[PDB]
Write an enzyme that holds these catalytic residues in place. Structure first.
Site, PDB file in Angstrom:
ATOM      1  N   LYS A  36      45.329  29.379  41.488  1.00 51.24           N
ATOM      2  CA  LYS A  36      44.847  29.808  41.416  1.00 51.24           C
ATOM      3  C   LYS A  36      44.358  30.243  42.071  1.00 51.24           C
ATOM      4  CE  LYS A  36      43.918  29.433  36.130  1.00 51.24           C
ATOM      5  NZ  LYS A  36      43.362  28.434  34.936  1.00 51.24           N
ATOM      6  N   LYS A  61      45.940  33.660  34.284  1.00 50.08           N
ATOM      7  CA  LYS A  61      46.466  32.326  34.920  1.00 50.08           C
ATOM      8  C   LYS A  61      46.936  32.115  35.767  1.00 50.08           C
ATOM      9  CE  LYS A  61      43.699  31.582  31.254  1.00 50.08           C
ATOM     10  NZ  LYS A  61      42.598  31.316  31.082  1.00 50.08           N
ATOM     11  N   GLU A  88      35.010  28.487  35.980  1.00 50.71           N
ATOM     12  CA  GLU A  88      33.444  27.362  36.725  1.00 50.71           C
ATOM     13  C   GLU A  88      34.248  26.013  36.316  1.00 50.71           C
ATOM     14  OE1 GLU A  88      31.373  27.616  32.541  1.00 50.71           O
ATOM     15  OE2 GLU A  88      29.770  28.950  33.555  1.00 50.71           O
TER      16      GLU A  88
END
Ligand SMILES: Cc1cc2nc3c(=O)[nH]c(=O)nc-3n(C[C@H](O)[C@H](O)[C@H](O)COP(=O)(O)O)c2cc1C
Ligand SMILES: Cc1cc2nc3c(=O)[nH]c(=O)nc-3n(C[C@H](O)[C@H](O)[C@H](O)COP(=O)(O)O)c2cc1C
Ligand SMILES: O=C(O)c1cccnc1
Ligand SMILES: O=C(O)c1cccnc1
Lengths: 217, 216
Positions: A74, A14, A165
């Site tokens: 990220k 994460k 995604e």
């Protein structure tokens, strides 16, 4: 390390440590993983954008806007970021590129051997493009298969990663002019080493029981 | 080490029917199936693992028509895995998933569990209601599982071959998948190749990176 141990211990990172970069060896290794994944009829209906520079990762990160701002850091902090793209349509030129490459690599013993392979590839290619009209989905599925191979591979290399995604594909495609080039972005995968903010690194993994998802016959 | 596995694996064209997976390997491949990642940990799948001659026969019935070339791979392999995807993402499944994550202790508070469920439903709704590409979204996750599987079984020292050359309508009916809420996508026979596996000694081939990959 045993591959099942790798499968049981890897996780979706994460947060990444921006000061930890892949070694030049690992950088080459992840590209090898991308290239050698298998695909239906060895169609390889894909394109990869590997962002390693600060400016490159910044361009990809632009797609993590609005409802996806949580994925932006990220993409920015990881050492390398891979954008998995699928062709938007299967054309005969690509089909010819593939079989000619197999020929160059020495997979055919005779000219008729090459002819047969091409006819065969063409057959299933047309079934999707001409009969079912789902070659776009068909190709995208091949890209997702590549992603699966990639996530296990990087984990086995001792690297952290996260499949994403949660990004605006319309923005990412535009940022790199993919549509006019014949492609569309599907998944973004940051790769590197996790940071102190990776809360998922200490949480136990969770999957449905096999008594629910698996039947033995 | 994993790179060597990736470069050495190949799609097996013929299996040795007398070579079976060890008990351990048979358990290991199931773990691989179960532990694959998926969007929102949706796990929109079901797997049929055929290991008996009768079971493999049932699956092999789908390799008819101009797919007969795949029939023998399904009958001779030690184990045959059928990868299936849900046909629709229902709220019951969403509840099942978050409840399992809760049981596994991923949530420190009821609020955290609610937040997780809210987030999952947001993307589930985006596909199920906004885009109506629900089915494709789940099918994509199943293919990701297949990719994970092929590399993993190769790392276990096992041969295998991914197969799209089969009749899904026939396979679905043979196992009554449609009514149960699933549909078959890919079949993967696993075992050890025979001397008849011509692909075991042919060079591997892939397009050059100068055409498929861009560094930025
Ligand atoms: C195709 C795909 C898309 C996903 N999207 C995201 C994302 O946008 N952001 C994120 O933090 N995790 C994302 N994930 C991570 C999942 O929530 C994760 O794989 C799952 O909860 C199982 O946990 P694990 O990967 O740690 O085993 C995605 C996973 C897949 C396979
Ligand atoms: C989803 C999928 C479906 C495929 N279908 C078949 C099939 O039906 N029969 C067969 O013999 N091989 C099948 N292939 C194997 C391919 O031709 C193969 O992966 C590819 O040429 C590259 O070869 P390699 O797997 O040996 O590296 C399939 C591959 C994938 C990934
Ligand atoms: O790769 C192949 O040989 C193949 C793929 C799909 C269907 N039939 C054959
Ligand atoms: O698994 C997730 O957390 C996820 C998946 C898709 C989009 N956003 C988040």
């Amino acid at each position: 390390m045993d591959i099942i141990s790798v499968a049981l211990k890897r996780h979706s990172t994460k947060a990444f440590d921006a000061s930890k970069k892949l070694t030049p060896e690992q950088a080459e290794q992840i590209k090898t993983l991308l290239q050698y994944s298998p695909s239906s009829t060895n169609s390889q209906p894909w394109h990869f954008i590997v962002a390693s520079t600060e400016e490159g990762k910044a361009r990809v990160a632009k797609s993590a806007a609005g409802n996806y701002v949580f994925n932006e850091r990220k993409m920015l902090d990881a050492s390398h970021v891979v954008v998995f793209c699928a062709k938007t349509a299967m054309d005969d030129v690509w089909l010819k590129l593939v079989v000619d490459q197999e020929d160059a690599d020495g997979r055919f013993a005779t000219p008729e051997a090459k002819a047969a392979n091409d006819k065969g590839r063409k057959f299933f290619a047309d079934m999707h493009r001409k009969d079912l009209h789902d070659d776009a989905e068909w190709m995208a599925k091949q890209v997702y298969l590549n992603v699966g191979n990639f996530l296990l591979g990087v984990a086995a290399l001792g690297l952290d990663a996260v499949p994403i995604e949660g990004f605006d594909a319309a923005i990412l495609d535009a940022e790199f002019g993919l549509k006019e080039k014949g492609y569309t972005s599907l998944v973004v995968v940051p790769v590197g080493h996790h940071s102190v903010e990776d809360f998922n690194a200490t949480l136990p993994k969770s999957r449905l029981p096999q008594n629910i998802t698996l039947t033995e016959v």
